């Protein structure tokens, strides 16, 4: 009979288990025998207190490096303001030691945990690339609770070295199965930010994770967008509980918050899943998340049923992760077919946007060719356009099976006149749909101002396969 942790703060880890059913169903995975044994997770952040009493037992120097100071030791820089506590807090969510009388437990409390010290300094493209590409045949899962500024006016993503690190990771990492990159979707909710304007979250190579409050609501800091894949619990208002983890200076905190806490919990759940089937590819893992995540009792006003009967929201993706369901489904999972890419250049001429622009195109999705796709994974609308005030634009993409993805909602703070330069807006909401047929792109001016611009390029990029579909939900 599985015995649950005895750690002093484990009873406060409401998000891991409970009779209330408002949890991530992690105890069910532990009871099936999966606690993270043999899996390696690295926290890319501001350092990791490797000697912390709740991390030392799981700490892995092979999963760690200090890119800011160019040395092996990711120990945080200590200051009066405790600025560099962030990475240690994320690490304990993944892999705090269990049954040792200290603080609480990680989701994967027997996994190995490392940290890359890379935020405590100038975060160049090279710094990011050396972190994302660290020891890719030893580290299985990378967790990143950072990204571009959440001011609600920035459009930014990986530069060349970092994007090369993503491609090298998913292609050759983990023995060719592909590095697993877990990303926090952002804290720009108050600024009405969009996580599709963040190229790290919007990347197909990352599992972008949003947050839900204890009572099942969209937290104040949450960013909505179509690239988000799933959700884990984090903080909310001051009547709602928060996240329990290891803190700087060998302390325990019950008040870790925001998007930062959701990605590490997802990374832990993914670690348990990898223990259940070490042969899962980077794409397999995204399929498992899509199929097992749970919308129930997450409140949002935009829940929609997609073409294969799955509920999806821009606040939550496919819903809350379900660790027990993940590890169960992983065990007899059949590896997905190799990824196909179908490129469709939509426009025959530039189109003035004006107050509203609708572009309709019927596609065959590379019919008759080796990259024919009947089972979509990610889809991108790669858009090049000029506009006088970028944040007044709202952009939607409708799939042939009727699923309306918001690629871009209005951003009141985005005054930019720089437009979008082949920006690859991504949606997860049409996963497993047949992409053959009519796609519709809608661009509209959400303001009363007489704005102006031109759409000069729209590439529809379809990823996926031509086999293995399930009966729709």
């Amino acid at each position: 009979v599985y015995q649950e942790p005895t750690d002093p703060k484990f009873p406060q880890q409401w998000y891991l288990s409970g009779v209330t059913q408002r949890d991530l169903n992690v105890k069910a995975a532990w009871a099936q025998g999966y606690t993270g044994h043999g899996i390696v997770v690295s926290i890319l952040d501001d350092g990791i207190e490797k000697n912390h009493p709740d991390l030392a037992g799981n700490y892995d120097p092979g999963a760690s490096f200090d890119v800011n100071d160019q040395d092996p030791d990711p120990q945080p820089r200590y200051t009066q303001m405790n600025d560099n506590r962030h990475g240690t807090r994320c690490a304990g969510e993944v892999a705090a030691v269990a049954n040792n009388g200290v603080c609480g437990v990680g989701v994967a409390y027997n996994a190995r945990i490392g940290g890359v010290r890379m935020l405590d300094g100038e975060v160049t493209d090279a710094v990011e690339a050396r972190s994302l590409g660290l020891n890719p045949n030893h580290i299985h899962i990378y967790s990143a609770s950072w990204g571009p500024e959440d001011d609600g006016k920035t459009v930014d993503g990986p530069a060349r070295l970092a994007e090369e690190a993503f491609f090298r990771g998913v292609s050759q990492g983990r023995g060719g199965l592909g590095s697993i990159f877990v990303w926090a979707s952002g804290n720009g909710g108050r600024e009405h930010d969009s996580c599709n304007c963040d190229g790290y979250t919007n990347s197909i190579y990352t599992l972008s994770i949003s947050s839900a409050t204890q009572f099942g609501n969209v937290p104040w800091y949450s960013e909505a967008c179509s690239s988000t894949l799933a959700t884990t619990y984090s903080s909310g208002n001051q009547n709602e509980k928060q996240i329990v983890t290891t803190d700087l200076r060998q302390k325990c905190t019950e008040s870790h918050t925001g998007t930062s806490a959701s990605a590490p919990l997802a990374a832990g759940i993914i670690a348990l899943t990898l223990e259940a089937n070490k042969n899962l590819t980077w794409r397999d893992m995204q399929h498992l998340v899509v199929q097992t995540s749970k919308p129930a009792h997450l409140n949002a006003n935009d829940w929609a049923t997609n073409g294969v009967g799955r509920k999806v929201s821009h606040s939550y993706g496919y819903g809350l992760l379900d660790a027990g369901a993940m590890v169960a489904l992983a065990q007899n999972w059949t590896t997905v077919a190799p990824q196909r890419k179908c490129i469709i250049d939509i426009l025959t001429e530039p189109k003035d946007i004006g107050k509203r622009l609708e572009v309709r195109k019927t596609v065959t999705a590379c019919l008759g060719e080796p990259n024919h796709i009947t089972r979509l994974e990610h889809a991108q609308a790669r858009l090049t356009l000029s506009y006088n005030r970028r944040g007044d634009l709202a952009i939607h993409l409708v799939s042939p099976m009727g699923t309306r993805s918001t690629l871009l909602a209005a951003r009141p703070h985005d005054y930019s006149a720089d437009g979008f330069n082949d920006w690859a807006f991504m949606t997860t909401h049409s996963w497993d749909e047949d992409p053959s047929g009519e796609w519709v792109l809608e661009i509209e001016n959400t303001s009363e101002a007489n704005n102006y611009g031109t759409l000069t390029k729209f590439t529809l990029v379809l990823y996926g396969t031509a086999s293995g579909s399930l009966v729709p939900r």
Binding site: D46, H86, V123, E128, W146, G147, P148, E149, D150, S260
Partner: peptide, 4 residues
Amino acid sequence: XRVX
């Protein structure tokens, strides 16, 4: 940028 890059923010925690």
